[PDB]
Design a protein around this nucleic acid. Structure first.
Lengths: 130, 118, 118
DNA sequence: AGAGGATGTGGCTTC
DNA sequence: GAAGCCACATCCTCT
């Protein structure tokens, strides 16, 4: 069971996904025990590698992010703002294909983000499983 | 028994006195210069009679079975909290690395003088 | 041993104590089992947090899949979950694309953990 | 002599 | 009062 049957609906319902469907505050959960500088150079460089660790401060739900389609360019943008970094990364969270999208201050190391169904991956996946 | 090191460190009575505070209290008492004393360098000190320092600590904490072997593990716990470090290579010589000046209000030279360290 | 469903239809995991001491080795090695087919060598990683701690400090939170099993060697929780509050595990299996499975109210971590009424 | 892991214990505070 | 957080007190293994 790589995914759940009611893939479409399980996202529409269930408090889990719901509570994480708006511009919820998010933060970089990495090397918290290290000087702010380090967490900065680390967090950014790591983004240039297409990966990062982030969680929704509010709900406290952590997540490992990988910025690639199911060396990146549009999945990790640093042009849409003079200091911010807009990211994006798909995944199969709890049997539901979704896409994480949000931004983060290249200094304060935090920002906003959320989840949104991935009709494509969900559909394709529903296939492989039938 | 010059300045009230215990107090200047934060101790107020509430809860046990902490090992570093108790040591400091012994370092500011001219009578204890036999077993514990300043090396005359910054806030570095030496326990000349560890077993003695341990007894008084044991006594002050009410743990009769205490001993240096144990007291030292206490000190070692400070390495990470940056209160007291170990003077490498010098037996029984440690050093306060927190800001004793700000707490005591005196400086190392000042205190060493007041305590008449030789 | 005994497994448990997670918030994902594709993964299972071992059972964790309800309350435990921080930085304290676990009573049962934590493992992640994959129902589906997952290529050996695949990396697996756990994280934790709650509405009191967005990201719990962990230790050895990484393991590689082997025969559908990712056996975590001495996983430890260092961040505290808060009085009453617990942690929400976020198991992550790195495949293409990565598969993440949560597990709410999984473990409660405190400084002392399970203690006999004083 | 000295570093540091593992775990239990009593003081005080907060829920 | 239980449940938390702290600072050790005890024990031990390794170098």
């Amino acid at each position: 069971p790589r995914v759940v049957p009611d893939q479409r609906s399980k996202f529409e319902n269930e408090e889990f996904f719901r509570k994480l469907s708006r511009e919820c505050e998010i933060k970089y959960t990495g090397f918290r025990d290290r000087p702010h500088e380090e967490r900065q150079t680390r967090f950014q460089n790591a983004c240039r590698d297409g990966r990062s660790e982030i969680a929704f401060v509010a709900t406290g739900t952590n997540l490992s992010l990988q910025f690639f389609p199911a060396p990146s360019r549009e999945y990790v943008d640093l042009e849409r703002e003079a200091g911010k970094v807009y990211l994006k990364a798909p995944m199969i969270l709890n049997g539901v294909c979704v896409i994480w999208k949000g931004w983060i201050d290249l200094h304060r190391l935090d920002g906003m983000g959320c989840l949104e169904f991935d009709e494509e991956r969900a559909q394709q996946e529903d296939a492989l499983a039938q | 028994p010059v300045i009230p090191a215990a107090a200047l460190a934060g101790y107020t009575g509430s809860g046990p006195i902490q090992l570093w505070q108790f040591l400091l209290e012994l370092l500011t008492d001219k009578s204890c210069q036999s077993f514990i004393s300043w090396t005359g360098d910054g806030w570095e000190f030496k326990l000349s009679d560890p077993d003695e320092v341990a007894r008084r600590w044991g006594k002050r904490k009410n743990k009769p079975k205490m001993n240096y072997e144990k007291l030292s593990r206490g000190l070692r716990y400070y390495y990470d909290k940056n209160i007291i470090h170990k003077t490498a290579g010098k037996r029984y010589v440690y050093r306060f690395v927190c800001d004793l000046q700000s707490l005591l209000g005196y400086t190392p030279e000042e205190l060493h003088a007041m305590l008449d360290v030789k | 041993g005994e497994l448990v469903r997670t918030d994902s239809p594709n993964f299972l995991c071992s059972v964790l104590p309800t309350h435990w001491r921080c930085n304290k080795t676990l009573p049962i090695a934590f493992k992640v089992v994959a129902k589906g087919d997952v290529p050996d060598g695949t990396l697996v990683t756990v994280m934790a947090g709650n509405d009191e701690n967005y990201s719990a400090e962990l230790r050895n939170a990484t393991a590689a899949m082997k025969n559908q099993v990712a056996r975590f060697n001495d996983l430890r929780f260092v961040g505290r979950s808060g009085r009453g509050k617990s942690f929400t595990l976020t198991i992550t299996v790195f495949t293409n694309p990565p598969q993440v499975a949560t597990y709410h109210r999984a473990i409660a971590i405190t400084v002392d953990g399970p203690r006999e009424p004083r």
